[PDB]
Structures are given as structure tokens and as C-alpha cells.
Design an enzyme around this catalytic site. Structure first.
Site, PDB file in Angstrom:
ATOM      1  N   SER A  86       1.984   0.942 -17.213  1.00 18.47           N
ATOM      2  CA  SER A  86       2.823   1.387 -18.310  1.00 18.47           C
ATOM      3  C   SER A  86       3.381   2.764 -17.998  1.00 18.47           C
ATOM      4  O   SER A  86       2.618   3.696 -17.729  1.00 18.47           O
ATOM      5  CB  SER A  86       2.042   1.428 -19.619  1.00 18.47           C
ATOM      6  OG  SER A  86       2.784   2.083 -20.622  1.00 18.47           O
ATOM      7  N   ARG A  87       4.707   2.883 -18.000  1.00 18.18           N
ATOM      8  CA  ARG A  87       5.327   4.193 -18.108  1.00 18.18           C
ATOM      9  C   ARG A  87       4.928   4.762 -19.450  1.00 18.18           C
ATOM     10  O   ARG A  87       5.409   4.311 -20.489  1.00 18.18           O
ATOM     11  CB  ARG A  87       6.845   4.076 -18.005  1.00 18.18           C
ATOM     12  CG  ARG A  87       7.644   5.363 -17.720  1.00 18.18           C
ATOM     13  CD  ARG A  87       8.044   6.159 -18.965  1.00 18.18           C
ATOM     14  NE  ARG A  87       8.495   5.300 -20.056  1.00 18.18           N
ATOM     15  CZ  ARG A  87       8.845   5.746 -21.257  1.00 18.18           C
ATOM     16  NH1 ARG A  87       8.870   7.048 -21.490  1.00 18.18           N
ATOM     17  NH2 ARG A  87       9.225   4.902 -22.205  1.00 18.18           N
ATOM     18  N   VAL A  88       4.078   5.790 -19.420  1.00 16.33           N
ATOM     19  CA  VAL A  88       3.163   6.092 -20.517  1.00 16.33           C
ATOM     20  C   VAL A  88       3.869   6.562 -21.795  1.00 16.33           C
ATOM     21  O   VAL A  88       3.244   6.634 -22.860  1.00 16.33           O
ATOM     22  CB  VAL A  88       2.110   7.096 -19.963  1.00 16.33           C
ATOM     23  CG1 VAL A  88       2.715   8.466 -19.725  1.00 16.33           C
ATOM     24  CG2 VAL A  88       0.823   7.145 -20.808  1.00 16.33           C
ATOM     25  N   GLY A  89       5.174   6.806 -21.743  1.00 12.63           N
ATOM     26  CA  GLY A  89       5.907   7.085 -22.957  1.00 12.63           C
ATOM     27  C   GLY A  89       5.753   8.528 -23.365  1.00 12.63           C
ATOM     28  O   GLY A  89       5.462   8.818 -24.531  1.00 12.63           O
TER      29      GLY A  89
END
Ligand code: ATP
Ligand code: MG
Lengths: 49, 502, 70
Positions: free
Chosen positions: B364-367
Site C-alpha cells: 500500500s502506498r501508505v497515503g
């Protein structure tokens, strides 16, 4: 919630009267049978102290 | 009865000249119409019997039209009329708590929805200026999701896996778990939800409204429903209609969430609908623009800047794959549109890890790392202690003995693996998560047995909600786990461990 | 079509002259409304009109523990 939808219901006679009769009594509570081992078991360990 | 008579005096019998095209053929849903001079492309045309349709192809002789309904009331020589509008669905907050079909008519029977504004299903995603980065969290209540693979607000996250592994249940614990924010007080922690059912039988969608109404979850969602019995142009139009009710929220301030269940059934409704219009097949007889079909959908899931309203629109597309192969045609075209994924497997589900999330592969592109401040402390170290576990814990055949060296580390994983398991339709909170995760990483469980940690959890959790309510309210309010808050928790786990098994 | 507007109200008023439920039920409406009235009671339960709750509960008997001590 017995009084809520019986008012919007039109078929009375056994509707508003059943909620009037069955909701006019006392709550049947439980019996207090646990008293003998409360005192008789306690002091025999304190007398052994 | 007064209701039927008042419906008939409000009816308007307006008459005007139409614009009209005689039918030349009708077979399998496609009605090549002679006439219809000034018709637009993607215009909604209306047959004589009450049916409705959308004129896709323009051509010099005929005009190709697909039907929203059934093609047996239509005979060669009929009359096709002109509405004068590219295809649009009603929108608003007035649809909240309903089950609707793919054009905004209620199939629950609570009546006519009173809606005031109409919004197209073919509108455009916003560009580069009116966005901002992802600041906020979106809590699912799953413990393998919130700690290890967090999801920000405004981020497209793909739940992918096989059939009967947990893809619908993962996205329904998420619907339930936002109950606690929606009866709260601030208007910026809520999350209004939307579920789009494509290609599903009605004895699953009428059963999911039951599970969402005992827990009173249905008072803040909408269910747009295009079942497997519907016309193939109604399963194609459904996610473009459900996404356009999401953008009432996002373009006015609030925060929405949308689940497409699933998007491998919005593709075979495009393959069939556009083979009978005589369009040449591509790979696996899919059309040329299945990538353009999914991409113009998954880019409206924005996160606007604060000079527009600041609202967000998360999206959770579900994808069913065959035999767990992720290199297919429609999977790989939608892996590379979403920021991160959640890889659900089968051998995790059956060995016992349920929810069966591959935490190794669930990247996940951690946001902008909007996990939260206290979970960063306990799941920062958890992420590394589990990663240390997975490199070294795959033998199943032992010959040598290194209890000071290796067997201490792999004893920290099975205590944290069996902590990560969960039930169903009972999602936790975040400070009830910080407490149970504190007791796992701080060595306070290595003297148990791993067949007792699932039993240890509920006895622990009932003790802290009952006896320690003012403790957990300082984690949720202050955000972080402070050093004096580190002090108070140090006794509670050890006082409970002193009298857990007796 | 206001000439049709009057003609569906005026044959709605004829329906407002009713004696016993249906006008043309015969064996149709009598069987269907009795088939449906069972199904709202068949898998639901056997319930009378006004009968209150009549039952009685017994609690757990409190046994004692024997213990020679010291
Ligand atoms: N957290 C959980 N723990 C254990 N079992 C679960 C959990 N969630 C779901 N299940 C079980 O797994 C099964 C499949 O779940 P679900 O129906 O969500 O899968 P699915 O892949 O969405 O199904 P379909 O392939 O029909 O869409 C169900 O029987 C459900 O009871
Ligand atoms: Mg599913």
C-alpha cells in the site's frame, strides 16, 4: 413498545385492553434461598483461626 | 381509498410533437432504428410500451440502440421517441437508506424517493489543481488492515482474490464499523457508504440488507442494485450511476465510500452488449477499451483541496480471479489504477488465518502515512517483528535447537499471528486495538499457550471496557500513548495476567 | 385527455359501493386471502389475540462448600 403500534392499529377491544390488563401488575421477583451457608460456613473458619 | 384518487388528479397529460424513428429490427436487445435524424450519441430514447434505451452507434443508414429492460414487447414497425437528454440519474441525500435499481427507481417499496437534482453518469474526473494529498484515516475495524495495511481517505484500494474467501465480508465489516462515528457529534469523522451489486442474485442482496439492518447500518447507506436477471446494458450502467451518487457528497463537503461488487461482471456486460452492435473483438473477445472502461471510473475517487470543500471519496473495487492467477487480462488492467491492494488467498483461509490477508504481499502506498499516532508506536514495531518472522519461519522439519537464538523470535510471531485473527460482523475500535496490541509486542504473552490467546483476548477486552473506561478515553482523545499512559497500562496487563488462568 | 380523467374517477366511485370485501372474488379471492392468512401464521407461530405471558423461572440452587481447614 406495546402501546405504540396498538394506538395506530384500529382493531381495539383485545388490543388496548390487553396492554391495559397485562401491564398493571407486579414483577415476579426471585426467591432468597441462599442464607444458610452464608453464616454457618463463615464462622467455622474464623473459629479455626 | 383516498390514495389512488389523489394519484390520478396529480397526473399531467401533456402532449407535444415528438421526434420519431421507425424500428427496422429487434433481436437480442439491439434495435436498429430508421429515422432519428437529430439524435445525439449516448442519448436516452424511449420506446412506445414504456421501455427505455440509449442510442450508442450513429451511422448514416441506421442508429444502434440498446434497451434498459426486455425486448419482447418490441416489434418491427414500432415507434422510438426522443427525450432530449444524455443519460442521467437522480442524486441527493434523500436516497439514503434505500435499495434502488440502476436508474434510480426504488425496489424496496417504501415509495417514491423525493429527489431534486439530477447528475449524469458520464461526468469527468477532476484534474491536478483541485486535489490535495491524503491527510485522514479510514478505520475498518479489522486488525490486520488497520495496523499493517492502512487505508487513507481518498485512496483507491483493491480487494482481490478468489470466490468464497472473504471479499464481501471485508467490505461489510467496514460498513458496520462506522456506526460509532455516525451517531457522534462532529461532522468530519462520519463516513457515508454506498454498495453496488452487479451480477448478484436477489437472494443475496435481500439478505445483506438484513445483516445491515439489525445493526442499524442501513440508516446511512444506499444500495444500487443490478441483479443477474437484468438487461446487459443495466449491469454496464450501474457503477457509473453509483459513483455519481458518491459525488454528491464529495462535491459538497462530506466523505463517501463506494464498493463495486464486483468489477469482473461490469466487463462481461460490456463484451456482450458491444458484440451485438457488430464491433470487432479484441483479446478474449473483450473490446478495445476495457482499460478505458475502468479508468474513467476509478479516477473520480478524489480528495479535494480545502478551498473547494475538502471532501473525499474512497473506493473499494472487488475483483474475482480464476484459480488465484493475478496475471489475467482484467486483473492487471485494474491493479495498475489503484494505489494499493489487499491480496486475499485460500490457503490462509483454510489453515486458519481469517480474514485471509496476505500481509506479505498486501502492499500500500501508505497515503501520507495517516495511520494514527498511537498505532504508529505499537504497529510500527509489529510490522518489523512480523517481517522478521516471515523470513525464518517456513521449515516444518527441525533438526537443530537454538532456543536462545531463533526460537525466541518465532515465538513472538505466533502470539502476534493468532492475535490478528477476528470474527465476523463485530468490528473493534482503535483504542481497543491499541490495548490488545500493546500486550502482544511487550513480551506479556510469551508465557501463555498459543491455543489460549483467542480466549485471552475476549476476557481481556471485557475487563477493560468494564473496569477501565477512563483509561481508553485518554488514548482516543490525546491521540498518542503518553509516558504516564504507558505507566498505567503496565500494571493492568500484569494484574490481569496474574489472575487470568486460575 | 381530461375526458379520460373523468372516466377513471367515475368508475372508481362505483368501486366505493362495497358490501363484503371483493366484488368478483368467488372462489378466487376467498382461497387466496385464506392461503395468505395461514402463511403469516404458519412459519410465524400460534398466537391468540390477547393472552398475556404465562410462565415461571427457577434460579440456580446455591450449594455449599465443605472445608476442614487450618
Ligand atoms: N472473518 C471471517 N472469519 C471466518 N469466516 C468468514 C469471515 N468472513 C467471512 N467468512 C466466511 O467465508 C465465506 C465466504 O465469505 P464471502 O461470502 O464474503 O466470500 P465471497 O468471496 O464474497 O463470496 P462470493 O465468491 O460468492 O462473492 C462465508 O461463508 C463466510 O461465512
Ligand atoms: Mg463477494
Amino acid at each position: 413498545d406495546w402501546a405504540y403500534y396498538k394506538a395506530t392499529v384500529a382493531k381495539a377491544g383485545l388490543v388496548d385492553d390487553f396492554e391495559k390488563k397485562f401491564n398493571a401488575l407486579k414483577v415476579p421477583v426471585p426467591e432468597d434461598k441462599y442464607t444458610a451457608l452464608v453464616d454457618a460456613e463463615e464462622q467455622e473458619d474464623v473459629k479455626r483461626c | 381509498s383516498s390514495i389512488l384518487e389523489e394519484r390520478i388528479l396529480g397526473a399531467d397529460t401533456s402532449v407535444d410533437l415528438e421526434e420519431t424513428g421507425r424500428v427496422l429490427s429487434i433481436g437480442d436487445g439491439i434495435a436498429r432504428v430508421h429515422g432519428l435524424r437529430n439524435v445525439q450519441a449516448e442519448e436516452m430514447v424511449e420506446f412506445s410500451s414504456g421501455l427505455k434505451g440509449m442510442s450508442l452507434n450513429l451511422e448514416p443508414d441506421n442508429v444502434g440502440v440498446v434497451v434498459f429492460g426486455n425486448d419482447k414487447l418490441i416489434k418491427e414497425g414500432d415507434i422510438v421517441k426522443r427525450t432530449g437528454a444524455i443519460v442521467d440519474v437522480p442524486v441527493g441525500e434523500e436516497l439514503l437508506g434505500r435499495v434502488v435499481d440502476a436508474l434510480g427507481n426504488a425496489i424496496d417499496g417504501k415509495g417514491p424517493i423525493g429527489s431534486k437534482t439530477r447528475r449524469r453518469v458520464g461526468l469527468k474526473a477532476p484534474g491536478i489543481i483541485p486535489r490535495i494529498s491524503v491527510r485522514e484515516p479510514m478505520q475498518t475495524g479489522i486488525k490486520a488492515v488497520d495496523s499493517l495495511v492502512p487505508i487513507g481517505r481518498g485512496q483507491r484500494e483493491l480487494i482481490i482474490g478468489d470466490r468464497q474467501t472473504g471479499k464481501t465480508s471485508i467490505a461489510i465489516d467496514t460498513i458496520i464499523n462506522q456506526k460509532r462515528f455516525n451517531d457522534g457529534t462532529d461532522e468530519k469523522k462520519k463516513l457515508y457508504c454506498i454498495y453496488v451489486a452487479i451480477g448478484q442474485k436477489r437472494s443475496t442482496v435481500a439478505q445483506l440488507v438484513k445483516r445491515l439492518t439489525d445493526a442499524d447500518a442501513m440508516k446511512y447507506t444506499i444500495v444500487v442494485s443490478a441483479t443477474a436477471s437484468d438487461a446487459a446494458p443495466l449491469q454496464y450502467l450501474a457503477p457509473y450511476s453509483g459513483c455519481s451518487m458518491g459525488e454528491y457528497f464529495r462535491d459538497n463537503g462530506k466523505h463517501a465510500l463506494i464498493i463495486y461488487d464486483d468489477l469482473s461482471k461490469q466487463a462481461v456486460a460490456y463484451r456482450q452488449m458491444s458484440l451485438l452492435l457488430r464491433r470487432p473483438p479484441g483479446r478474449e473477445a473483450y473490446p478495445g477499451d476495457v482499460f478505458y472502461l475502468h479508468s474513467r471510473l476509478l479516477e473520480r475517487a478524489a480528495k479535494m483541496n480545502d478551498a473547494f470543500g475538502g471532501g473525499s471519496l474512497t473506493a473499494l473495487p472487488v475483483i474475482e480471479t480464476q484459480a488465484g492467477d493475478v496475471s489475467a487480462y482484467i486483473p492487471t488492467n485494474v491493479i495498475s489504477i489503484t494505489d494499493g491492494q489487499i491480496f486475499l488467498e485460500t490457503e490462509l483461509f483454510y489453515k486458519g488465518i481469517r480474514p485471509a490477508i496476505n500481509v506479505g504481499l498486501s502492499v500500500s502506498r501508505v497515503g501520507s502515512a495517516a495511520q494514527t499516532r498511537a498505532m504508529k508506536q505499537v504497529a510500527g514495531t509489529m510490522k518489523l517483528e512480523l517481517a522478521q518472522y516471515r523470513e525464518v519461519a517456513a521449515f516444518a522439519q527441525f533438526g537443530s535447537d537454538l532456543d536462545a537464538a531463533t526460537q525466541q523470535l518465532l515465538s513472538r510471531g505466533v502470539r502476534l499471528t493468532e492475535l490478528l485473527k477476528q470474527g465476523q460482523y463485530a468490528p473493534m475500535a482503535i483504542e481497543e486495538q491499541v490495548a490488545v496490541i500493546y500486550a502482544g509486542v511487550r513480551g506479556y504473552l510469551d508465557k501463555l499457550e498459543p491455543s489460549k490467546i483467542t480466549k485471552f483476548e475476549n476476557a481481556f477486552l471485557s475487563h477493560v471496557i468494564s473496569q477501565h473506561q477512563a483509561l481508553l478515553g485518554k488514548i482516543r482523545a490525546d491521540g498518542k500513548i503518553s509516558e504516564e499512559t504507558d505507566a498505567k497500562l503496565k500494571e493492568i496487563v500484569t494484574n490481569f495476567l496474574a489472575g487470568f488462568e486460575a | 385527455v381530461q375526458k379520460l380523467f373523468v372516466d377513471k374517477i367515475r368508475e372508481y366511485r362505483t368501486k366505493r359501493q362495497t358490501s363484503g370485501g371483493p366484488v368478483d372474488a368467488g372462489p378466487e379471492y376467498q382461497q387466496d386471502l385464506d392461503r395468505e392468512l395461514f402463511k403469516l401464521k404458519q412459519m410465524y407461530g400460534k398466537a391468540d389475540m390477547n393472552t398475556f405471558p404465562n410462565f415461571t423461572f427457577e434460579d440456580p440452587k446455591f450449594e455449599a462448600v465443605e472445608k476442614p481447614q487450618s
